[PDB]
């Protein structure tokens, strides 16, 4: 019975790592997109300043 | 006025394209809310399996 | 002209307030990228420990 739970615990660990690792990739990609939006606000703010 | 139109028309181009970057970031949250949520559900199996 | 100026000031205000929301979104990524990454490492320890 313990050996059976070891596979389940070990399986959920690897399966959770795949989702956790994949959840980190989408998070890092989202951060880069957020960084691009940060520069956009500076462009809009800078562009709006020129209009003023 | 012509200089303003050159910036207003150019500003809308950055707001529209810039908005896509914000909407794209929102899609990342769906993956995080969907991927990390499953990890939390599978996390119970790891703890439950350890209880056994 | 003064009417448009009031819109620029209000528009820049939304950029400042919007930037805070955008920058705030980046801070969450630093926690998600740091929390999920740490969780991913825990799975490796549990998975490796489960093998033992």
Q: Torsion over CA of A25, A31, A34 and A36, rounded to 10 degrees?
A: -90
User: Which residue pairs from C46-52 have beta carbons closer than 8 angstroms and sit at least 24 positions apart in sequence?
Assistant: C46/A9, C46/A10, C46/A13, C46/B46, C47/A10, C47/A13, C47/A14, C47/A17, C50/A6, C50/A9, C50/A10, C50/A13, C51/A10
Six-digit token string for A49? 């300043």
Q: How far apart are CA B35 and CA B25, in angstroms?
A: 15
Six-digit token string for C24? 């705030």
Contact A44 B28 (CB under 8 A): no
Method of elucidation: cryo-EM
Half-sphere exposure of C50 (CA within 13 A, CB side): 23
Q: How far apart are CA A48 and CA A50, in angstroms?
A: 5
Residue in B with minimal Cα distance to C4:
B4
B24 to chain A, any CB pair closer than 8 A? The answer is: yes
């Amino acid at each position: 019975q313990l050996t059976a739970t070891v596979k389940q615990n070990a399986e959920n660990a690897r399966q959770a790592s795949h989702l956790a690792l994949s959840a980190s990739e989408t998070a890092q990609r989202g951060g880069k997109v957020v960084d691009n939006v940060v520069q956009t606000m500076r462009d809009i703010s800078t562009s709006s300043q020129k209009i003023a | 006025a012509r200089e303003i139109k050159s910036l207003i028309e150019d500003s809308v181009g950055k707001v529209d394209v810039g908005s896509t970057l914000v909407e794209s970031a929102g899609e990342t949250m769906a993956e995080i809310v969907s991927a990390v949520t499953r990890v939390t559900d599978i996390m119970g199996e790891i703890a439950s399996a350890s209880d056994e």
